[PDB]
Ligand binder design. Structure first.
Ligand SMILES: *[C@@H]1O[C@H](CO[C@@H]2O[C@@H](C)[C@@H](O)[C@@H](O)[C@@H]2O)[C@@H](O[C@@H]2O[C@H](CO)[C@@H](O[C@@H]3O[C@H](CO[C@H]4O[C@H](CO)[C@@H](O)[C@H](O)[C@@H]4O[C@@H]4O[C@H](CO)[C@@H](O[C@@H]5O[C@H](CO)[C@H](O)[C@H](O)[C@H]5O)[C@H](O)[C@H]4NC(C)=O)[C@@H](O)[C@H](O[C@H]4O[C@H](CO)[C@@H](O)[C@H](O)[C@@H]4O[C@@H]4O[C@H](CO)[C@@H](O)[C@H](O)[C@H]4NC(C)=O)[C@@H]3O)[C@H](O)[C@H]2NC(C)=O)[C@H](O)[C@H]1NC(C)=O
Ligand SMILES: [Zn+2]
Ligand SMILES: [Zn+2]
Ligand SMILES: [Zn+2]
Ligand SMILES: [Zn+2]
Ligand SMILES: [Zn+2]
Ligand SMILES: [Zn+2]
Ligand SMILES: [Zn+2]
Ligand SMILES: [Zn+2]
Ligand SMILES: [Zn+2]
Ligand SMILES: [Zn+2]
Length: 210
């Protein structure tokens, strides 16, 4: 029938750290050998731009060609809602294919970050759960990590964002540590990246209070 276009956003962390390079990815699949030519046009807010890096086509094991084009986006443009259009032209199509993407839309809402110590009843266990509540944020793109003086604490798991009853999102992150480390008074820190925080970052700390 005709080829199909997919347009993918940057990775969320790449949009929240100015040191990183967010990029948007236009993928064309189902390109026939009969008309194998593929032209990309990129627009930012309706204005054609020219810095996209297209990859040379690559044949698939199902006898179709796959062509990829990558446009780097500016940290501030993406956060300011600019919209990115990929236009794919190929002989086999009646009219060119237009896909548009941007950051999740909606008024931004800054998260409230709260650490919760292990439950009393959980103090019987050889491991305990440190809880980071992140609530009230909009949009849902977010990243959460845990640290203890310098090094990342990676035995943690974070729930997906959940739509709350006021239209904002919340989640929880659970860090599991040896009960000894928690009682040795060590400081544990939940750090949160989200667009609506100052510099898109905050951290909150948790320690035994005796
Ligand atoms: C012939 O073969 C080719 C490929 O060869 C095959 O290789 C694999 C795939 C084998 O399975 C086998 O087939 C062959 O060996 C086939 O090509 C495939 O075609 C199908 C369509 O038929 C495509 O399906 C869509 O996939 C989307 C998800 O794709 C991602 O995830 C899958 C794995 O789950 C991967 O396979 C893909 O490569 C994609 O991976 C993502 O790619 C991004 C770009 O690289 C990554 O982002 C980038 O990441 C880098 C670092 O890695 C940087 O961070 C960059 O900054 C960043 O931009 C991303 O991380 C990566 N993810 C992963 C996990 O790797 C689906 O989203 C899509 O769903 C759409 O369609 C469904 C129904 O059609 C439905 O669920 C939805 O409606 C959805 O539609 C979109 O949804 C939105 C919102 O809901 C709506 O608005 C729209 O409806 C719609 N719009 C848009 C714009 O999307 C499809 O399921 C498949 O991806 C593609 N494969 C490849 C490799 O390209 C071909 O079909 C075969 N043909 C025949 C006839 O056999
Ligand atoms: Zn031009
Ligand atoms: Zn050009
Ligand atoms: Zn931009
Ligand atoms: Zn950005
Ligand atoms: Zn945007
Ligand atoms: Zn649009
Ligand atoms: Zn980090
Ligand atoms: Zn603030
Ligand atoms: Zn400042
Ligand atoms: Zn910024």
């Amino acid at each position: 029938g005709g080829p199909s276009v997919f347009l993918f956003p940057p990775k969320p962390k790449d949009t929240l750290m100015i040191s990183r390079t967010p990029e948007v990815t236009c993928v064309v699949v189902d390109v026939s050998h009969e008309d194998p030519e593929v032209k990309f046009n990129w627009y930012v807010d309706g204005v054609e731009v020219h810095n996209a890096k297209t990859k040379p086509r690559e044949e698939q094991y199902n006898s179709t060609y796959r062509v990829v084009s990558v446009l780097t986006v500016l940290h501030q443009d993406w956060l300011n809602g600019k919209e990115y259009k990929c236009k794919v032209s190929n002989k086999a199509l009646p009219a060119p294919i237009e896909k548009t993407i941007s950051k999740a839309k909606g008024q931004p809402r800054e998260p409230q970050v709260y650490t919760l110590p292990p439950s009393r009843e959980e103090m019987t266990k050889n491991q305990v759960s440190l809880t980071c509540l992140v609530k009230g944020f909009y949009p849902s793109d977010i990243a959460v990590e845990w640290e203890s003086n310098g090094q990342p604490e990676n035995n943690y798991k974070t729930t997906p964002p959940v739509l709350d009853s006021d239209g904002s999102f919340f989640l929880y992150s659970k860090l599991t540590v040896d009960k000894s480390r928690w009682q040795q008074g060590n400081v544990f820190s939940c750090s949160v990246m989200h667009e609506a925080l100052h510099n898109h970052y905050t951290q909150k700390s948790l320690s035994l209070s005796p």
